[PDB]
Design a protein around this motif. Structure first.
Motif, PDB file in Angstrom:
ATOM      1  N   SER A 148       6.845   8.253  -6.523  1.00 23.28           N
ATOM      2  CA  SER A 148       6.226   6.786  -6.419  1.00 23.28           C
ATOM      3  C   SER A 148       6.035   6.448  -7.985  1.00 23.28           C
ATOM      4  CB  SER A 148       5.135   6.462  -5.472  1.00 23.28           C
ATOM      5  OG  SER A 148       5.444   6.906  -4.359  1.00 23.28           O
ATOM      6  N   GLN A 149       6.311   6.943  -9.066  1.00 27.19           N
ATOM      7  CA  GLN A 149       5.872   6.831 -10.378  1.00 27.19           C
ATOM      8  C   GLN A 149       7.196   5.752 -11.023  1.00 27.19           C
ATOM      9  N   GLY A 150       8.481   5.828 -10.576  1.00 31.38           N
ATOM     10  CA  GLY A 150       9.469   5.721 -11.365  1.00 31.38           C
ATOM     11  C   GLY A 150      10.270   4.393 -10.942  1.00 31.38           C
ATOM     12  N   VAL A 151      11.277   4.175 -11.261  1.00 28.89           N
ATOM     13  CA  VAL A 151      11.984   3.009 -11.124  1.00 28.89           C
ATOM     14  C   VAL A 151      12.731   3.045  -9.594  1.00 28.89           C
ATOM     15  CG1 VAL A 151      14.004   1.380 -11.771  1.00 28.89           C
ATOM     16  CG2 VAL A 151      12.527   2.591 -13.480  1.00 28.89           C
ATOM     17  N   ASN A 152      11.890   2.992  -8.579  1.00 32.53           N
ATOM     18  CA  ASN A 152      12.286   3.221  -7.195  1.00 32.53           C
ATOM     19  C   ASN A 152      12.903   1.993  -6.441  1.00 32.53           C
ATOM     20  OD1 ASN A 152       9.395   5.393  -7.168  1.00 32.53           O
ATOM     21  ND2 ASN A 152      11.365   6.029  -7.889  1.00 32.53           N
ATOM     22  N   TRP A 153      13.910   2.588  -5.413  1.00 34.52           N
ATOM     23  CA  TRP A 153      14.406   1.611  -4.342  1.00 34.52           C
ATOM     24  C   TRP A 153      14.425   2.665  -3.293  1.00 34.52           C
ATOM     25  CZ3 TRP A 153      15.421  -3.635  -4.429  1.00 34.52           C
ATOM     26  CH2 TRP A 153      15.901  -4.117  -3.071  1.00 34.52           C
ATOM     27  N   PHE A 154      13.324   2.755  -2.425  1.00 31.04           N
ATOM     28  CA  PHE A 154      13.118   3.778  -1.392  1.00 31.04           C
ATOM     29  C   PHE A 154      14.295   4.217  -0.625  1.00 31.04           C
ATOM     30  CE2 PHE A 154      12.130   5.838   2.369  1.00 31.04           C
ATOM     31  CZ  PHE A 154      11.372   6.833   1.991  1.00 31.04           C
ATOM     32  N   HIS A 155      14.876   3.048  -0.130  1.00 32.83           N
ATOM     33  CA  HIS A 155      15.791   3.201   1.133  1.00 32.83           C
ATOM     34  C   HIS A 155      17.388   3.603   0.601  1.00 32.83           C
ATOM     35  CE1 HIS A 155      12.270   1.677   3.100  1.00 32.83           C
ATOM     36  NE2 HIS A 155      12.756   2.516   4.050  1.00 32.83           N
ATOM     37  N   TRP A 156      17.300   3.622  -0.678  1.00 33.88           N
ATOM     38  CA  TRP A 156      18.599   4.111  -1.575  1.00 33.88           C
ATOM     39  C   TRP A 156      18.136   5.639  -2.052  1.00 33.88           C
ATOM     40  CZ3 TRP A 156      20.683   3.291  -7.110  1.00 33.88           C
ATOM     41  CH2 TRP A 156      21.992   3.619  -6.877  1.00 33.88           C
ATOM     42  N   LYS A 157      17.376   5.548  -2.925  1.00 35.60           N
ATOM     43  CA  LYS A 157      17.214   6.776  -3.475  1.00 35.60           C
ATOM     44  C   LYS A 157      15.692   7.504  -3.424  1.00 35.60           C
ATOM     45  CE  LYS A 157      21.447   7.239  -5.572  1.00 35.60           C
ATOM     46  NZ  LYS A 157      22.022   8.444  -4.922  1.00 35.60           N
ATOM     47  N   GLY A 158      14.893   7.009  -2.585  1.00 35.33           N
ATOM     48  CA  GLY A 158      13.652   7.646  -2.332  1.00 35.33           C
ATOM     49  C   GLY A 158      12.815   7.220  -3.403  1.00 35.33           C
ATOM     50  N   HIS A 159      11.597   8.299  -3.563  1.00 36.02           N
ATOM     51  CA  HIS A 159      10.292   7.852  -4.239  1.00 36.02           C
ATOM     52  C   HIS A 159      10.355   9.006  -5.404  1.00 36.02           C
ATOM     53  CE1 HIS A 159       7.684   5.448  -1.545  1.00 36.02           C
ATOM     54  NE2 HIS A 159       8.438   4.493  -2.482  1.00 36.02           N
ATOM     55  N   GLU A 160      11.204   9.963  -5.368  1.00 35.03           N
ATOM     56  CA  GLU A 160      11.379  11.029  -6.387  1.00 35.03           C
ATOM     57  C   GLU A 160      12.539  11.131  -7.525  1.00 35.03           C
ATOM     58  OE1 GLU A 160      10.005  14.258  -3.730  1.00 35.03           O
ATOM     59  OE2 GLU A 160       8.325  14.788  -5.151  1.00 35.03           O
ATOM     60  N   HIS A 161      13.017   9.774  -7.505  1.00 35.29           N
ATOM     61  CA  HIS A 161      14.453   9.578  -8.212  1.00 35.29           C
ATOM     62  C   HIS A 161      13.950   8.210  -8.930  1.00 35.29           C
ATOM     63  CE1 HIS A 161      18.800  10.142  -8.281  1.00 35.29           C
ATOM     64  NE2 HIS A 161      18.584   9.064  -9.354  1.00 35.29           N
ATOM     65  N   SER A 162      14.126   8.129 -10.187  1.00 34.67           N
ATOM     66  CA  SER A 162      13.905   6.807 -11.018  1.00 34.67           C
ATOM     67  C   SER A 162      15.340   6.365 -11.210  1.00 34.67           C
ATOM     68  CB  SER A 162      13.097   7.124 -12.221  1.00 34.67           C
ATOM     69  OG  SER A 162      12.729   6.028 -12.973  1.00 34.67           O
ATOM     70  N   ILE A 163      15.522   5.150 -11.030  1.00 35.03           N
ATOM     71  CA  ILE A 163      16.864   4.683 -11.025  1.00 35.03           C
ATOM     72  C   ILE A 163      17.198   4.339 -12.677  1.00 35.03           C
ATOM     73  CG2 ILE A 163      18.413   2.592 -10.419  1.00 35.03           C
ATOM     74  CD1 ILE A 163      16.499   3.100  -7.621  1.00 35.03           C
ATOM     75  N   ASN A 190       0.986  -1.257  -0.103  1.00 33.97           N
ATOM     76  CA  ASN A 190      -0.086  -0.124   0.089  1.00 33.97           C
ATOM     77  C   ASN A 190       1.034   1.334  -0.082  1.00 33.97           C
ATOM     78  OD1 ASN A 190      -2.114   1.461   0.358  1.00 33.97           O
ATOM     79  ND2 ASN A 190      -2.119   1.515   2.427  1.00 33.97           N
ATOM     80  N   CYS A 191       1.819   1.397  -1.118  1.00 33.32           N
ATOM     81  CA  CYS A 191       1.873   0.609  -2.105  1.00 33.32           C
ATOM     82  C   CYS A 191       3.416   0.101  -2.421  1.00 33.32           C
ATOM     83  CB  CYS A 191       1.519   1.289  -3.652  1.00 33.32           C
ATOM     84  SG  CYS A 191      -0.308   1.394  -3.602  1.00 33.32           S
ATOM     85  N   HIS A 192       4.439   0.889  -2.076  1.00 26.02           N
ATOM     86  CA  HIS A 192       5.603   0.413  -2.276  1.00 26.02           C
ATOM     87  C   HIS A 192       6.806   1.059  -1.849  1.00 26.02           C
ATOM     88  CE1 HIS A 192       7.219   3.225  -5.625  1.00 26.02           C
ATOM     89  NE2 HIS A 192       5.936   3.138  -6.107  1.00 26.02           N
ATOM     90  N   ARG A 193       7.802   0.058  -1.546  1.00 22.83           N
ATOM     91  CA  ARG A 193       9.204   0.790  -1.261  1.00 22.83           C
ATOM     92  C   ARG A 193       9.932   0.401  -2.494  1.00 22.83           C
ATOM     93  NH1 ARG A 193       5.652   2.956   1.184  1.00 22.83           N
ATOM     94  NH2 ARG A 193       5.371   2.617   3.188  1.00 22.83           N
ATOM     95  N   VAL A 194       9.828  -0.643  -3.224  1.00 26.36           N
ATOM     96  CA  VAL A 194      10.610  -1.015  -4.469  1.00 26.36           C
ATOM     97  C   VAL A 194       9.435  -1.014  -5.507  1.00 26.36           C
ATOM     98  CG1 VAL A 194      11.707  -2.965  -5.480  1.00 26.36           C
ATOM     99  CG2 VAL A 194      12.211  -2.480  -3.015  1.00 26.36           C
ATOM    100  N   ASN A 195       9.646  -0.361  -6.748  1.00 27.28           N
ATOM    101  CA  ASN A 195       8.834  -0.349  -7.884  1.00 27.28           C
ATOM    102  C   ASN A 195       9.881  -0.536  -9.244  1.00 27.28           C
ATOM    103  OD1 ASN A 195       6.197   0.154  -8.802  1.00 27.28           O
ATOM    104  ND2 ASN A 195       7.245   2.131  -9.511  1.00 27.28           N
ATOM    105  N   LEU A 196      10.675  -1.716  -9.272  1.00 30.30           N
ATOM    106  CA  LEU A 196      11.771  -1.571 -10.423  1.00 30.30           C
ATOM    107  C   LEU A 196      10.924  -1.978 -11.815  1.00 30.30           C
ATOM    108  CD1 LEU A 196      14.574  -3.539  -8.723  1.00 30.30           C
ATOM    109  CD2 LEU A 196      14.245  -1.349  -8.837  1.00 30.30           C
ATOM    110  N   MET A 197       9.588  -2.060 -11.729  1.00 26.21           N
ATOM    111  CA  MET A 197       8.800  -2.313 -12.986  1.00 26.21           C
ATOM    112  C   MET A 197       8.019  -1.219 -13.218  1.00 26.21           C
ATOM    113  SD  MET A 197       9.370  -5.521 -11.414  1.00 26.21           S
ATOM    114  CE  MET A 197       8.110  -6.745 -11.183  1.00 26.21           C
TER     115      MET A 197
END
Ligand SMILES: Cc1nsc(N2CCCNCC2)n1
Length: 211
Positions: free
Chosen positions: A181-196, A165-172
């Motif tokens: 929260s829209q991008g290729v996220n790994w929250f505990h590395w680069k947060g939710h406003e940085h697409s990897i 509800n919903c994610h800390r990982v969003n690699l798809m």
């Protein structure tokens, strides 16, 4: 060499040390051939790559059937398939590795136990036993079913994942999308406003480190 290697660890021990495409055989069955990309260089090699993001050319906002079956070019951006991941992780005790790279910075996560359940579990994720530098962002997701827009976080973030509800990982997620929260996220590395820029998820037997 083994005739019907069941993963990239049995293909690597077959003396194939170059990363690239290899045939594996689910359950060592010659009638269950699968072409996989083997990462033979990262932390000792023997890894089946099951997700790659690197350039935004492939669409990851795909439906349940696509996520179950797999899609994309295994040499470039792709998703291996949940049915494949269930069958591979059923063969033994597997470990997950995630490799991340963004503007020359790298991080990684390893989970000593990784499995994916079958379709009647909606491909339930198990991830336990974290080590690494990316931060433990998969713990939030542990035990969750898979979600696509047609089976809602997948719809809200236009991706697919073992969403909660919903994610800390969003690699798809959506490539290059720095919106929250829209991008290729790994929250505990680069947060939710940085697409990897670059992300791989891969698996191999947890015992390969001392076999
Ligand atoms: C650092 C590292 N991770 S796996 C690995 N090997 C695979 C098993 C064969 N023997 C040792 C080489 N090395």
């Amino acid at each position: 060499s083994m005739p019907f290697p069941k993963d990239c660890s049995q293909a690597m021990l077959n003396g194939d040390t170059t990363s690239g495409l290899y045939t594996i055989y689910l359950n060592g069955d010659k009638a269950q051939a699968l072409e996989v990309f083997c990462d033979m260089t990262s932390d000792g090699g023997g890894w089946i790559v099951f997700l790659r993001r690197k350039n935004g050319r492939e669409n990851f906002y795909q439906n349940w059937k696509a996520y179950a079956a797999g899609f994309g070019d295994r040499r470039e951006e792709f998703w291996l398939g949940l049915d494949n991941l269930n069958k591979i992780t059923a063969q033994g005790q597997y470990e997950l590795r995630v490799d991340l790279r963004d503007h020359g910075e790298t991080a990684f996560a390893v989970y000593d136990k990784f499995s994916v359940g079958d379709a009647k579990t909606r491909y339930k994720l198990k991830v336990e036993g974290y080590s690494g530098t990316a931060g433990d962002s998969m713990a939030y997701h542990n035990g969750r079913s898979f979600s696509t827009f047609d089976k809602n976080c997948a719809l809200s973030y236009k991706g697919a994942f073992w969403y909660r509800n919903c994610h800390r990982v969003n690699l798809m997620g959506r490539y290059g999308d720095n919106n929250h929260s829209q991008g290729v996220n790994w929250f505990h590395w680069k947060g939710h406003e940085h697409s990897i820029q670059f992300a791989e998820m891969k698996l191999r037997p947890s015992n390969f480190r001392n076999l």
